[PDB]
Amino acid sequence: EVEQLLQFHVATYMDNDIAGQPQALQKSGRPVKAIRARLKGKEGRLRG
Amino acid sequence: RSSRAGLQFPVGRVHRLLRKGNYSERVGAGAPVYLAAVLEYLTAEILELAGNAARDNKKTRIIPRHLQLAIRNDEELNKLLGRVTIAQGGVLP
Amino acid sequence: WEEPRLILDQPAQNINKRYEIRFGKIYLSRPTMTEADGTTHAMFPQEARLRNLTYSSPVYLDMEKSMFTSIDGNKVHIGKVPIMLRSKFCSLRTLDEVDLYKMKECPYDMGGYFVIN
Amino acid sequence: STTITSGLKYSLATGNWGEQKKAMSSRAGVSQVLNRYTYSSTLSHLRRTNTPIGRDGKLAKPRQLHNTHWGLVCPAETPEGQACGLVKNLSLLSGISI
Amino acid sequence: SYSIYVYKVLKQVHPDTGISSKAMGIMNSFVNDIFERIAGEASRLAHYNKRSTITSREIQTAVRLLLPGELAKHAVSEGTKAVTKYTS
Amino acid sequence: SRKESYSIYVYKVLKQVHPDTGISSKAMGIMNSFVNDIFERIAGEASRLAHYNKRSTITSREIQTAVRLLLPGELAKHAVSEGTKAVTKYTS
Amino acid sequence: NIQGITKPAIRRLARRGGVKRISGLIYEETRGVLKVFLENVIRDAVTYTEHAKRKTVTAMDVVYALKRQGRTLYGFGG
DNA sequence: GGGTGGTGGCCGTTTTCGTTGTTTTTTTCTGTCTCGTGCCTC
RNA sequence: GGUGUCUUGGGUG
DNA sequence: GGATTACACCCAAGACACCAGGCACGAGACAGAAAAAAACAACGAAAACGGCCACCACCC
């Protein structure tokens, strides 16, 4: 259980858009801004 | 004890017999209560039927024959005591 | 009254013990204001607009707790509901034009909105 | 008592129609700041309507002025851009059943 | 012996009925027999599971193993009932 | 964690009685079953023997009587010989 | 699944038991008997399994059930 | 006709109370389990 | 000498 | 269903704790004994229950 918690924290630290599972959430209900989310999109690093 | 458990059978004695019966190193508080209750129940069932048999034969006292009749004419009691010989019990006609 | 009753239960070994409450009437009062002193008074939309208050009415729900044991609770305040201005529960519904002017309200203002903060 | 009060206040103050922890998957914009720039803008804002189709989808059919709209929604008043045809405005003699 | 307890039970279920000496002897044999069956099975149950204590749970399981059908259900009921009452 | 069987002792005995004979794993399992079974029979009977006679100690005498009750005839006599000889030698 | 105990299988068992000729009604009869047998052993086995708070019937549970039914089995204590 | 299924009086014998010898269940203080409570998170 | 982050709604081109 | 439905730009108004059950301390519940009044077995008696006897009725 605890090693899988570690696996999930490490995964959602890098990619919080994994199909077929809940998202790592913040205190306010919003999801965590993962690094992938930092890098992708109109507003991400590359295009923004 | 037995008064508190609502039983006639001796809880203290059953407990002691469990302790000295080489069954386990320790014996729980509820075990002799449970066991005494079971023994009393079975005794009650057999005495019920055997008493009924005595009434049929018009004898107030209960004799081994009545016990045999009671046990063998009851399916589950009969299985429970399938390998038991009741002295002076005879057999079912 | 959609779901008008709650029920707890425990049978065990033996008495059946149900604790139960039945929701009753709703009571709707005019919008009031409560100060940090504890004093209260009527609240009007202009005051609510100036002091960044919410213009809402207190809602009370009667609750009647019952218990049954077979061997085999006042006007609870549940929250404040915001009031639509110029509706039947607004404090501007009465007060014809003169007192509307005295209450700093524009006669052309038609209502239809809420005041939150 | 703070549960109902905080919920009603949160929904009417943010527009997110639903529980606070379910802000996503809840309708947004249900409540809006009343437009008081001029008088007619207030009168129009108090009579506005919204179809929650969303901009995810280029189906032009629900954005279209329809024959059955006659007398019920204004044939001319609609926002430009992504709300065109989705935000409607009641005709002067329109009325909503109770 | 269990004579006095057997008698008490007898007076519960048949107030005006007695019992011969031989029949009492048979009842005593019975009680000791069932005692040994149940205690023995409970002992083995405790050993198999590396438990050093025989509790009411071993007694119950042993009863379920040893007794047939309705007798098992009723005996289990009486045991649990007695333990509950004693505990109260 | 540690696991235990009579396997090596059964093997040693096998090598005593048949130096050029081996044994399958399943047959070894059956032998282990056997040894445990007879153990429980003898120890149980000896326990009852000690209890019947109001004794708190199981001795070689209880074991011997139990052997005489449980085993038939010549098997019993031979077993008794082996046991008695082993105890007499051990004490010395 | 009791029907999975086929006529040929029962015939083989009877052959090992030395039976030369078999009445047609035997097979169903046998299915009944076996069924009962299994019910009695498995019951006790599951009881042991339930006593140990397990969800897995072990070989030892079966062995104990067989033993208490006077059907001692050798070879599965390992 | 030879048993077996009924009636009523007399004699054996007997297991439960009156009462006690012998054995016995547990309350309070101390040393372990178990839960309520406080700080912090294409 | 150092004037913070994200969503909802309404517009302009 | 990982995406995503044009670019720049303008201000309205909102969260800034979601939450229980994580770790350790202190208050209930349980196990350990024994002398003394209470329960079990023992000494003796009682009419009451069971087998016998004087006397009795029926069938293949």
From Swiss-Prot, chain B:
The keyword Kinase does not apply. The modification N6-(beta-hydroxybutyryl)lysine is found at K20, K79. GO terms for cellular component: CENP-A containing nucleosome; extracellular exosome; nucleosome; nucleus. Its main location: nucleus. The keyword Acetylation applies. It is found in: Nucleus; Chromosome. Keywords: Acetylation, Chromosome, Citrullination, DNA-binding, Hydroxylation, Isopeptide bond, Methylation, Nucleosome core, Nucleus, Phosphoprotein, Ubl conjugation. Belongs to the histone H2A family. This is Histone H2A type 1-B/E. The chain holds residues 18 to 110 of 130 of the full protein.
UniProtKB/Swiss-Prot annotation, chain E:
The modification N6,N6,N6-trimethyllysine is found at K50. Keywords: Acetylation, ADP-ribosylation, Antibiotic, Antimicrobial, Chromosome, DNA-binding, Glycoprotein, Hydroxylation, Isopeptide bond, Methylation, Nucleosome core, Nucleus, Phosphoprotein, Ubl conjugation. It is found in: Nucleus; Chromosome. The modification Phosphoserine is found at S1. The modification N6-methyllysine is found at K11, K73. Core component of nucleosome. Nucleosomes wrap and compact DNA into chromatin, limiting DNA accessibility to the cellular machineries which require DNA as a template. Histones thereby play a central role in transcription regulation, DNA repair, DNA replication and chromosomal stability. DNA accessibility is regulated via a complex set of post-translational modifications of histones, also called histone code, and nucleosome remodeling. Has broad antibacterial activity. May contribute to the formation of the functional antimicrobial barrier of the colonic epithelium, and to the bactericidal activity of amniotic fluid. This is Histone H2B type 1-J. The lineage of its organism: Eukaryota, Metazoa, Chordata, Craniata, Vertebrata. The chain holds residues 37 to 124 of 126 of the full protein.
From Swiss-Prot, chain F:
The modification N6-malonyllysine is found at K85. The modification Omega-N-methylarginine is found at R55, R61. The modification N6-methylated lysine is found at K85. The modification N6-methyllysine is found at K15, K77. The modification N6-acetyllysine is found at K54. The modification PolyADP-ribosyl glutamic acid is found at E4. Keywords: Acetylation, ADP-ribosylation, Antibiotic, Antimicrobial, Chromosome, DNA-binding, Glycoprotein, Hydroxylation, Isopeptide bond, Methylation, Nucleosome core, Nucleus, Phosphoprotein, Ubl conjugation. Its main location: nucleus. The modification N6-succinyllysine is found at K3, K85, K89. The modification N6-glutaryllysine is found at K3, K12, K15, K77, K85, K89. GO terms for biological process: antibacterial humoral response; antimicrobial humoral immune response mediated by antimicrobial peptide; chromatin organization; defense response to Gram-negative bacterium; defense response to Gram-positive bacterium; innate immune response in mucosa; killing of cells of another organism; negative regulation of tumor necrosis factor-mediated signaling pathway. The modification N6-lactoyllysine is found at K12, K54, K77, K85, K89. The modification N6-(beta-hydroxybutyryl)lysine is found at K3, K54, K85, K89. The modification N6-(2-hydroxyisobutyryl)lysine is found at K3, K12, K15, K26, K54, K77, K85, K89. It is found in: Nucleus; Chromosome. It comes from the Eukaryota. GO terms for molecular function: DNA binding; lipopolysaccharide binding; protein heterodimerization activity; structural constituent of chromatin. The nucleosome is a histone octamer containing two molecules each of H2A, H2B, H3 and H4 assembled in one H3-H4 heterotetramer and two H2A-H2B heterodimers. The octamer wraps approximately 147 bp of DNA. Heterodimer H2BC11 and H2AZ1 interacts with VPS72 (via N-terminal domain). This is Histone H2B type 1-J. It comes from Homo sapiens. The gene is H2BC11. The chain holds residues 33 to 124 of 126 of the full protein.
From Swiss-Prot, chain G:
There is a cross-link at K67 (Glycyl lysine isopeptide (Lys-Gly) (interchain with G-Cter in ubiquitin)). The modification N6-(beta-hydroxybutyryl)lysine is found at K7, K53, K67. The modification Phosphoserine is found at S23. Signal peptide: none annotated. The modification N6-lactoyllysine is found at K7, K53, K67. Acetylated as part of spermatogenesis progression prior to histone-to-protamine exchange. It is found in: Nucleus; Chromosome. One of its GO terms (biological process) is telomere organization. The modification N6-glutaryllysine is found at K7, K35, K53, K55, K67. The keyword DNA-binding applies. Disulfide bonds: none annotated. Changing R21C: In TEBIVANED3. There is a cross-link at K7 (Glycyl lysine isopeptide (Lys-Gly) (interchain with G-Cter in UFM1)). Keywords: Acetylation, Chromosomal rearrangement, Chromosome, Citrullination, Disease variant, DNA-binding, Hydroxylation, Intellectual disability, Isopeptide bond, Methylation, Nucleosome core, Nucleus, Phosphoprotein, Ubl conjugation. Changing R11W: In TEBIVANED3; results in early developmental defects when expressed in zebrafish embryos. The modification N6-propionyllysine is found at K7, K20, K53, K55, K67. The modification N6-butyryllysine is found at K7, K20, K53, K55, K67. Changing G70R: Found in a patient with a neurodevelopmental disorder; uncertain significance. One of its GO terms (cellular component) is CENP-A containing nucleosome. Core component of nucleosome. Nucleosomes wrap and compact DNA into chromatin, limiting DNA accessibility to the cellular machineries which require DNA as a template. Histones thereby play a central role in transcription regulation, DNA repair, DNA replication and chromosomal stability. DNA accessibility is regulated via a complex set of post-translational modifications of histones, also called histone code, and nucleosome remodeling. Belongs to the histone H4 family. This is Histone H4. The lineage of its organism: Eukaryota, Metazoa, Chordata, Craniata, Vertebrata.
